[PDB]
PDB file of all heavy atoms in Angstrom:
ATOM      1  N   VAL A 358     -25.027  30.145 -26.459  1.00 37.04           N
ATOM      2  CA  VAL A 358     -25.734  29.968 -27.717  1.00 37.04           C
ATOM      3  C   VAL A 358     -26.326  31.291 -28.200  1.00 37.04           C
ATOM      4  O   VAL A 358     -26.137  31.681 -29.347  1.00 37.04           O
ATOM      5  CB  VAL A 358     -26.818  28.845 -27.639  1.00 37.04           C
ATOM      6  CG1 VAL A 358     -27.542  28.737 -28.978  1.00 37.04           C
ATOM      7  CG2 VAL A 358     -26.203  27.525 -27.205  1.00 37.04           C
ATOM      8  N   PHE A 359     -27.049  31.970 -27.314  1.00 35.25           N
ATOM      9  CA  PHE A 359     -27.659  33.228 -27.728  1.00 35.25           C
ATOM     10  C   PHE A 359     -26.626  34.299 -28.051  1.00 35.25           C
ATOM     11  O   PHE A 359     -26.804  35.060 -29.005  1.00 35.25           O
ATOM     12  CB  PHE A 359     -28.685  33.751 -26.718  1.00 35.25           C
ATOM     13  CG  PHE A 359     -29.855  32.828 -26.592  1.00 35.25           C
ATOM     14  CD1 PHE A 359     -30.124  32.172 -25.408  1.00 35.25           C
ATOM     15  CD2 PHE A 359     -30.704  32.614 -27.683  1.00 35.25           C
ATOM     16  CE1 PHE A 359     -31.212  31.238 -25.326  1.00 35.25           C
ATOM     17  CE2 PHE A 359     -31.789  31.722 -27.595  1.00 35.25           C
ATOM     18  CZ  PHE A 359     -32.000  31.035 -26.421  1.00 35.25           C
ATOM     19  N   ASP A 360     -25.529  34.358 -27.286  1.00 36.88           N
ATOM     20  CA  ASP A 360     -24.520  35.346 -27.605  1.00 36.88           C
ATOM     21  C   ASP A 360     -23.929  35.082 -29.003  1.00 36.88           C
ATOM     22  O   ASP A 360     -23.654  36.023 -29.759  1.00 36.88           O
ATOM     23  CB  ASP A 360     -23.368  35.301 -26.591  1.00 36.88           C
ATOM     24  CG  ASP A 360     -23.711  35.930 -25.268  1.00 36.88           C
ATOM     25  OD1 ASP A 360     -24.803  36.519 -25.078  1.00 36.88           O
ATOM     26  OD2 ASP A 360     -22.819  35.835 -24.391  1.00 36.88           O
ATOM     27  N   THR A 361     -23.696  33.806 -29.329  1.00 35.52           N
ATOM     28  CA  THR A 361     -23.113  33.422 -30.618  1.00 35.52           C
ATOM     29  C   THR A 361     -24.085  33.689 -31.775  1.00 35.52           C
ATOM     30  O   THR A 361     -23.689  34.190 -32.825  1.00 35.52           O
ATOM     31  CB  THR A 361     -22.644  31.951 -30.575  1.00 35.52           C
ATOM     32  OG1 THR A 361     -21.692  31.827 -29.530  1.00 35.52           O
ATOM     33  CG2 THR A 361     -22.035  31.500 -31.886  1.00 35.52           C
ATOM     34  N   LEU A 362     -25.371  33.369 -31.563  1.00 39.96           N
ATOM     35  CA  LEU A 362     -26.366  33.737 -32.533  1.00 39.96           C
ATOM     36  C   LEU A 362     -26.359  35.251 -32.772  1.00 39.96           C
ATOM     37  O   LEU A 362     -26.352  35.716 -33.932  1.00 39.96           O
ATOM     38  CB  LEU A 362     -27.770  33.312 -32.047  1.00 39.96           C
ATOM     39  CG  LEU A 362     -28.076  31.818 -32.166  1.00 39.96           C
ATOM     40  CD1 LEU A 362     -29.421  31.499 -31.474  1.00 39.96           C
ATOM     41  CD2 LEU A 362     -28.060  31.362 -33.609  1.00 39.96           C
ATOM     42  N   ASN A 363     -26.357  36.028 -31.683  1.00 40.95           N
ATOM     43  CA  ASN A 363     -26.362  37.476 -31.861  1.00 40.95           C
ATOM     44  C   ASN A 363     -25.108  37.963 -32.591  1.00 40.95           C
ATOM     45  O   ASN A 363     -25.160  38.920 -33.378  1.00 40.95           O
ATOM     46  CB  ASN A 363     -26.504  38.152 -30.509  1.00 40.95           C
ATOM     47  CG  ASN A 363     -26.735  39.623 -30.614  1.00 40.95           C
ATOM     48  OD1 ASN A 363     -27.760  40.060 -31.131  1.00 40.95           O
ATOM     49  ND2 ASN A 363     -25.775  40.399 -30.133  1.00 40.95           N
ATOM     50  N   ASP A 364     -23.971  37.308 -32.347  1.00 38.28           N
ATOM     51  CA  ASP A 364     -22.701  37.675 -32.984  1.00 38.28           C
ATOM     52  C   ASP A 364     -22.726  37.398 -34.473  1.00 38.28           C
ATOM     53  O   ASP A 364     -22.063  38.102 -35.221  1.00 38.28           O
ATOM     54  CB  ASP A 364     -21.535  36.856 -32.408  1.00 38.28           C
ATOM     55  CG  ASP A 364     -21.139  37.254 -31.004  1.00 38.28           C
ATOM     56  OD1 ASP A 364     -21.582  38.310 -30.544  1.00 38.28           O
ATOM     57  OD2 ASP A 364     -20.382  36.477 -30.364  1.00 38.28           O
ATOM     58  N   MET A 365     -23.416  36.334 -34.913  1.00 41.15           N
ATOM     59  CA  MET A 365     -23.272  35.794 -36.264  1.00 41.15           C
ATOM     60  C   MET A 365     -24.485  36.075 -37.173  1.00 41.15           C
ATOM     61  O   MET A 365     -24.338  36.139 -38.403  1.00 41.15           O
ATOM     62  CB  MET A 365     -23.001  34.275 -36.195  1.00 41.15           C
ATOM     63  CG  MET A 365     -21.704  33.910 -35.421  1.00 41.15           C
ATOM     64  SD  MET A 365     -21.251  32.173 -35.447  1.00 41.15           S
ATOM     65  CE  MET A 365     -20.978  31.966 -37.242  1.00 41.15           C
ATOM     66  N   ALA A 366     -25.684  36.189 -36.584  1.00 42.59           N
ATOM     67  CA  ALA A 366     -26.899  36.326 -37.402  1.00 42.59           C
ATOM     68  C   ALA A 366     -26.974  37.708 -38.042  1.00 42.59           C
ATOM     69  O   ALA A 366     -26.449  38.684 -37.508  1.00 42.59           O
ATOM     70  CB  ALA A 366     -28.128  36.129 -36.513  1.00 42.59           C
ATOM     71  N   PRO A 367     -27.654  37.839 -39.179  1.00 41.28           N
ATOM     72  CA  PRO A 367     -27.858  39.169 -39.751  1.00 41.28           C
ATOM     73  C   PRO A 367     -28.694  40.049 -38.852  1.00 41.28           C
ATOM     74  O   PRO A 367     -29.473  39.545 -38.021  1.00 41.28           O
ATOM     75  CB  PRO A 367     -28.590  38.884 -41.072  1.00 41.28           C
ATOM     76  CG  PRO A 367     -29.278  37.599 -40.818  1.00 41.28           C
ATOM     77  CD  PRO A 367     -28.306  36.786 -39.978  1.00 41.28           C
ATOM     78  N   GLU A 368     -28.532  41.346 -38.994  1.00 40.55           N
ATOM     79  CA  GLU A 368     -29.276  42.300 -38.189  1.00 40.55           C
ATOM     80  C   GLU A 368     -30.780  42.232 -38.399  1.00 40.55           C
ATOM     81  O   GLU A 368     -31.539  42.708 -37.545  1.00 40.55           O
ATOM     82  CB  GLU A 368     -28.784  43.726 -38.463  1.00 40.55           C
ATOM     83  CG  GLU A 368     -27.322  43.934 -38.109  1.00 40.55           C
ATOM     84  CD  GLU A 368     -26.878  45.384 -38.193  1.00 40.55           C
ATOM     85  OE1 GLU A 368     -27.753  46.276 -38.164  1.00 40.55           O
ATOM     86  OE2 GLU A 368     -25.652  45.624 -38.290  1.00 40.55           O
ATOM     87  N   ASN A 369     -31.204  41.689 -39.524  1.00 39.31           N
ATOM     88  CA  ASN A 369     -32.629  41.518 -39.821  1.00 39.31           C
ATOM     89  C   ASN A 369     -33.089  40.073 -39.654  1.00 39.31           C
ATOM     90  O   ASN A 369     -34.128  39.679 -40.213  1.00 39.31           O
ATOM     91  CB  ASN A 369     -32.998  42.076 -41.195  1.00 39.31           C
ATOM     92  CG  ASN A 369     -32.359  41.336 -42.301  1.00 39.31           C
ATOM     93  OD1 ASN A 369     -31.496  40.520 -42.092  1.00 39.31           O
ATOM     94  ND2 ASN A 369     -32.818  41.602 -43.544  1.00 39.31           N
ATOM     95  N   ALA A 370     -32.365  39.276 -38.886  1.00 38.72           N
ATOM     96  CA  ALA A 370     -32.842  37.932 -38.558  1.00 38.72           C
ATOM     97  C   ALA A 370     -34.195  37.998 -37.869  1.00 38.72           C
ATOM     98  O   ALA A 370     -34.574  38.999 -37.247  1.00 38.72           O
ATOM     99  CB  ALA A 370     -31.875  37.232 -37.650  1.00 38.72           C
ATOM    100  N   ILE A 371     -34.895  36.874 -37.944  1.00 40.38           N
ATOM    101  CA  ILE A 371     -36.148  36.663 -37.216  1.00 40.38           C
ATOM    102  C   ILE A 371     -35.970  35.407 -36.391  1.00 40.38           C
ATOM    103  O   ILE A 371     -35.568  34.388 -36.932  1.00 40.38           O
ATOM    104  CB  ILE A 371     -37.340  36.447 -38.174  1.00 40.38           C
ATOM    105  CG1 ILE A 371     -37.541  37.676 -39.088  1.00 40.38           C
ATOM    106  CG2 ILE A 371     -38.609  36.154 -37.369  1.00 40.38           C
ATOM    107  CD1 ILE A 371     -38.493  37.410 -40.266  1.00 40.38           C
ATOM    108  N   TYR A 372     -36.287  35.507 -35.104  1.00 42.24           N
ATOM    109  CA  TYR A 372     -36.133  34.392 -34.179  1.00 42.24           C
ATOM    110  C   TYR A 372     -37.477  33.838 -33.767  1.00 42.24           C
ATOM    111  O   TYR A 372     -38.467  34.556 -33.641  1.00 42.24           O
ATOM    112  CB  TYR A 372     -35.399  34.844 -32.941  1.00 42.24           C
ATOM    113  CG  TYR A 372     -34.010  35.343 -33.232  1.00 42.24           C
ATOM    114  CD1 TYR A 372     -33.720  36.712 -33.343  1.00 42.24           C
ATOM    115  CD2 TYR A 372     -32.948  34.437 -33.385  1.00 42.24           C
ATOM    116  CE1 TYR A 372     -32.419  37.186 -33.559  1.00 42.24           C
ATOM    117  CE2 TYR A 372     -31.646  34.922 -33.638  1.00 42.24           C
ATOM    118  CZ  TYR A 372     -31.402  36.276 -33.711  1.00 42.24           C
ATOM    119  OH  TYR A 372     -30.110  36.710 -33.925  1.00 42.24           O
ATOM    120  N   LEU A 373     -37.511  32.528 -33.533  1.00 43.49           N
ATOM    121  CA  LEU A 373     -38.659  31.912 -32.854  1.00 43.49           C
ATOM    122  C   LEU A 373     -38.133  31.167 -31.624  1.00 43.49           C
ATOM    123  O   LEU A 373     -37.004  30.664 -31.617  1.00 43.49           O
ATOM    124  CB  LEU A 373     -39.487  30.989 -33.758  1.00 43.49           C
ATOM    125  CG  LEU A 373     -40.209  31.721 -34.892  1.00 43.49           C
ATOM    126  CD1 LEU A 373     -39.322  31.973 -36.106  1.00 43.49           C
ATOM    127  CD2 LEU A 373     -41.478  30.967 -35.311  1.00 43.49           C
ATOM    128  N   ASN A 374     -38.953  31.166 -30.576  1.00 44.12           N
ATOM    129  CA  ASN A 374     -38.599  30.581 -29.285  1.00 44.12           C
ATOM    130  C   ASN A 374     -39.529  29.468 -28.922  1.00 44.12           C
ATOM    131  O   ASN A 374     -40.717  29.729 -28.681  1.00 44.12           O
ATOM    132  CB  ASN A 374     -38.653  31.664 -28.212  1.00 44.12           C
ATOM    133  CG  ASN A 374     -38.383  31.147 -26.829  1.00 44.12           C
ATOM    134  OD1 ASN A 374     -37.856  30.029 -26.639  1.00 44.12           O
ATOM    135  ND2 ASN A 374     -38.705  31.966 -25.827  1.00 44.12           N
ATOM    136  N   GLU A 375     -39.010  28.250 -28.829  1.00 42.20           N
ATOM    137  CA  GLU A 375     -39.774  27.199 -28.141  1.00 42.20           C
ATOM    138  C   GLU A 375     -38.790  26.406 -27.280  1.00 42.20           C
ATOM    139  O   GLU A 375     -38.708  25.195 -27.327  1.00 42.20           O
ATOM    140  CB  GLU A 375     -40.596  26.330 -29.083  1.00 42.20           C
ATOM    141  CG  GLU A 375     -41.807  25.708 -28.444  1.00 42.20           C
ATOM    142  CD  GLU A 375     -42.743  25.187 -29.529  1.00 42.20           C
ATOM    143  OE1 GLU A 375     -43.535  26.001 -30.062  1.00 42.20           O
ATOM    144  OE2 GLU A 375     -42.638  23.990 -29.893  1.00 42.20           O
ATOM    145  N   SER A 376     -38.022  27.167 -26.502  1.00 39.94           N
ATOM    146  CA  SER A 376     -37.013  26.658 -25.562  1.00 39.94           C
ATOM    147  C   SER A 376     -37.300  27.390 -24.265  1.00 39.94           C
ATOM    148  O   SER A 376     -36.615  28.362 -23.904  1.00 39.94           O
ATOM    149  CB  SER A 376     -35.628  26.995 -26.118  1.00 39.94           C
ATOM    150  OG  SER A 376     -34.568  26.629 -25.266  1.00 39.94           O
ATOM    151  N   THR A 377     -38.403  27.072 -23.576  1.00 39.28           N
ATOM    152  CA  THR A 377     -38.859  28.052 -22.566  1.00 39.28           C
ATOM    153  C   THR A 377     -37.981  28.161 -21.327  1.00 39.28           C
ATOM    154  O   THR A 377     -38.026  29.213 -20.687  1.00 39.28           O
ATOM    155  CB  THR A 377     -40.340  27.937 -22.148  1.00 39.28           C
ATOM    156  OG1 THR A 377     -40.487  26.833 -21.256  1.00 39.28           O
ATOM    157  CG2 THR A 377     -41.214  27.804 -23.380  1.00 39.28           C
ATOM    158  N   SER A 378     -37.173  27.118 -20.993  1.00 37.60           N
ATOM    159  CA  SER A 378     -36.285  27.332 -19.851  1.00 37.60           C
ATOM    160  C   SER A 378     -35.217  28.377 -20.137  1.00 37.60           C
ATOM    161  O   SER A 378     -34.548  28.797 -19.201  1.00 37.60           O
ATOM    162  CB  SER A 378     -35.652  26.036 -19.342  1.00 37.60           C
ATOM    163  OG  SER A 378     -34.672  25.580 -20.235  1.00 37.60           O
ATOM    164  N   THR A 379     -35.093  28.837 -21.374  1.00 36.34           N
ATOM    165  CA  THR A 379     -34.065  29.791 -21.722  1.00 36.34           C
ATOM    166  C   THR A 379     -34.612  31.130 -22.195  1.00 36.34           C
ATOM    167  O   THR A 379     -33.844  31.971 -22.705  1.00 36.34           O
ATOM    168  CB  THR A 379     -33.067  29.174 -22.735  1.00 36.34           C
ATOM    169  OG1 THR A 379     -33.674  28.909 -23.997  1.00 36.34           O
ATOM    170  CG2 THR A 379     -32.491  27.886 -22.233  1.00 36.34           C
ATOM    171  N   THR A 380     -35.905  31.367 -22.005  1.00 34.43           N
ATOM    172  CA  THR A 380     -36.547  32.566 -22.544  1.00 34.43           C
ATOM    173  C   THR A 380     -35.936  33.853 -22.016  1.00 34.43           C
ATOM    174  O   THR A 380     -35.717  34.785 -22.771  1.00 34.43           O
ATOM    175  CB  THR A 380     -38.047  32.530 -22.201  1.00 34.43           C
ATOM    176  OG1 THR A 380     -38.604  31.419 -22.907  1.00 34.43           O
ATOM    177  CG2 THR A 380     -38.745  33.829 -22.596  1.00 34.43           C
ATOM    178  N   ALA A 381     -35.665  33.902 -20.720  1.00 36.74           N
ATOM    179  CA  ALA A 381     -35.123  35.146 -20.156  1.00 36.74           C
ATOM    180  C   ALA A 381     -33.788  35.504 -20.794  1.00 36.74           C
ATOM    181  O   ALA A 381     -33.522  36.655 -21.130  1.00 36.74           O
ATOM    182  CB  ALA A 381     -34.971  35.009 -18.634  1.00 36.74           C
ATOM    183  N   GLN A 382     -32.936  34.508 -20.932  1.00 38.01           N
ATOM    184  CA  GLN A 382     -31.631  34.729 -21.542  1.00 38.01           C
ATOM    185  C   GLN A 382     -31.751  35.132 -22.990  1.00 38.01           C
ATOM    186  O   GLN A 382     -30.989  35.965 -23.481  1.00 38.01           O
ATOM    187  CB  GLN A 382     -30.795  33.464 -21.421  1.00 38.01           C
ATOM    188  CG  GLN A 382     -30.488  33.097 -19.980  1.00 38.01           C
ATOM    189  CD  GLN A 382     -31.348  31.938 -19.467  1.00 38.01           C
ATOM    190  OE1 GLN A 382     -32.586  31.862 -19.679  1.00 38.01           O
ATOM    191  NE2 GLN A 382     -30.682  30.996 -18.792  1.00 38.01           N
ATOM    192  N   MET A 383     -32.687  34.520 -23.715  1.00 35.59           N
ATOM    193  CA  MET A 383     -32.900  34.877 -25.094  1.00 35.59           C
ATOM    194  C   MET A 383     -33.254  36.350 -25.237  1.00 35.59           C
ATOM    195  O   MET A 383     -32.692  37.079 -26.072  1.00 35.59           O
ATOM    196  CB  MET A 383     -33.987  33.983 -25.682  1.00 35.59           C
ATOM    197  CG  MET A 383     -34.189  34.156 -27.160  1.00 35.59           C
ATOM    198  SD  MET A 383     -35.352  32.931 -27.777  1.00 35.59           S
ATOM    199  CE  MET A 383     -35.229  33.169 -29.532  1.00 35.59           C
ATOM    200  N   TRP A 384     -34.226  36.802 -24.433  1.00 38.63           N
ATOM    201  CA  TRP A 384     -34.643  38.188 -24.489  1.00 38.63           C
ATOM    202  C   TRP A 384     -33.535  39.152 -24.097  1.00 38.63           C
ATOM    203  O   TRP A 384     -33.546  40.295 -24.551  1.00 38.63           O
ATOM    204  CB  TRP A 384     -35.846  38.430 -23.576  1.00 38.63           C
ATOM    205  CG  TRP A 384     -37.161  38.212 -24.261  1.00 38.63           C
ATOM    206  CD1 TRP A 384     -37.939  37.096 -24.209  1.00 38.63           C
ATOM    207  CD2 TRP A 384     -37.868  39.148 -25.058  1.00 38.63           C
ATOM    208  NE1 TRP A 384     -39.081  37.273 -24.960  1.00 38.63           N
ATOM    209  CE2 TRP A 384     -39.072  38.531 -25.474  1.00 38.63           C
ATOM    210  CE3 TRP A 384     -37.594  40.449 -25.481  1.00 38.63           C
ATOM    211  CZ2 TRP A 384     -40.005  39.199 -26.296  1.00 38.63           C
ATOM    212  CZ3 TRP A 384     -38.512  41.094 -26.274  1.00 38.63           C
ATOM    213  CH2 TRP A 384     -39.708  40.447 -26.682  1.00 38.63           C
ATOM    214  N   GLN A 385     -32.598  38.737 -23.247  1.00 37.79           N
ATOM    215  CA  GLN A 385     -31.491  39.611 -22.867  1.00 37.79           C
ATOM    216  C   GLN A 385     -30.411  39.676 -23.922  1.00 37.79           C
ATOM    217  O   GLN A 385     -29.699  40.673 -23.992  1.00 37.79           O
ATOM    218  CB  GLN A 385     -30.885  39.160 -21.548  1.00 37.79           C
ATOM    219  CG  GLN A 385     -31.821  39.397 -20.393  1.00 37.79           C
ATOM    220  CD  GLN A 385     -31.341  38.745 -19.119  1.00 37.79           C
ATOM    221  OE1 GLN A 385     -30.141  38.464 -18.954  1.00 37.79           O
ATOM    222  NE2 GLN A 385     -32.281  38.460 -18.207  1.00 37.79           N
ATOM    223  N   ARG A 386     -30.247  38.642 -24.733  1.00 40.08           N
ATOM    224  CA  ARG A 386     -29.013  38.460 -25.486  1.00 40.08           C
ATOM    225  C   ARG A 386     -29.135  38.660 -26.987  1.00 40.08           C
ATOM    226  O   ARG A 386     -28.107  38.715 -27.673  1.00 40.08           O
ATOM    227  CB  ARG A 386     -28.401  37.110 -25.132  1.00 40.08           C
ATOM    228  CG  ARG A 386     -27.880  37.109 -23.708  1.00 40.08           C
ATOM    229  CD  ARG A 386     -27.482  35.707 -23.202  1.00 40.08           C
ATOM    230  NE  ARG A 386     -27.110  35.779 -21.803  1.00 40.08           N
ATOM    231  CZ  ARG A 386     -25.935  36.228 -21.361  1.00 40.08           C
ATOM    232  NH1 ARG A 386     -24.967  36.567 -22.208  1.00 40.08           N
ATOM    233  NH2 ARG A 386     -25.733  36.337 -20.061  1.00 40.08           N
ATOM    234  N   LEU A 387     -30.367  38.746 -27.513  1.00 36.09           N
ATOM    235  CA  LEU A 387     -30.572  38.989 -28.934  1.00 36.09           C
ATOM    236  C   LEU A 387     -30.955  40.431 -29.154  1.00 36.09           C
ATOM    237  O   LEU A 387     -31.973  40.908 -28.642  1.00 36.09           O
ATOM    238  CB  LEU A 387     -31.653  38.064 -29.521  1.00 36.09           C
ATOM    239  CG  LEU A 387     -31.353  36.568 -29.347  1.00 36.09           C
ATOM    240  CD1 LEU A 387     -32.468  35.733 -29.983  1.00 36.09           C
ATOM    241  CD2 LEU A 387     -30.003  36.179 -29.977  1.00 36.09           C
ATOM    242  N   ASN A 388     -30.161  41.141 -29.953  1.00 36.08           N
ATOM    243  CA  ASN A 388     -30.519  42.484 -30.377  1.00 36.08           C
ATOM    244  C   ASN A 388     -31.492  42.357 -31.543  1.00 36.08           C
ATOM    245  O   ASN A 388     -31.092  41.908 -32.623  1.00 36.08           O
ATOM    246  CB  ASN A 388     -29.250  43.230 -30.806  1.00 36.08           C
ATOM    247  CG  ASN A 388     -29.544  44.664 -31.174  1.00 36.08           C
ATOM    248  OD1 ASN A 388     -30.716  45.073 -31.253  1.00 36.08           O
ATOM    249  ND2 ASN A 388     -28.502  45.434 -31.410  1.00 36.08           N
ATOM    250  N   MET A 389     -32.744  42.703 -31.287  1.00 36.88           N
ATOM    251  CA  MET A 389     -33.819  42.620 -32.306  1.00 36.88           C
ATOM    252  C   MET A 389     -34.243  44.065 -32.575  1.00 36.88           C
ATOM    253  O   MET A 389     -35.051  44.643 -31.819  1.00 36.88           O
ATOM    254  CB  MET A 389     -34.975  41.766 -31.802  1.00 36.88           C
ATOM    255  CG  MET A 389     -34.516  40.316 -31.649  1.00 36.88           C
ATOM    256  SD  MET A 389     -35.828  39.200 -31.072  1.00 36.88           S
ATOM    257  CE  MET A 389     -36.053  39.771 -29.398  1.00 36.88           C
TER     258      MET A 389
END
């Protein structure tokens, strides 16, 4: 999911996280 979001979202996207079992992966996989 995070890889696909990173592939498709605009470079100026803004993310919010309330999926805490996946926080580590989120931080690794989204270029912010």
Side-chain angles (χ1 to χ4, degrees):
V358 179
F359 296 116
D360 284 355
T361 301
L362 284 172
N363 189 65
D364 288 347
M365 300 186 63
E368 299 188 19
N369 66 350
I371 300 167
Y372 298 99
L373 294 83
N374 177 16
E375 206 165 277
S376 176
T377 77
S378 73
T379 66
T380 295
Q382 296 103 316
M383 187 174 188
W384 271 98
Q385 291 170 23
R386 291 170 185 282
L387 302 181
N388 184 352
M389 294 181 291

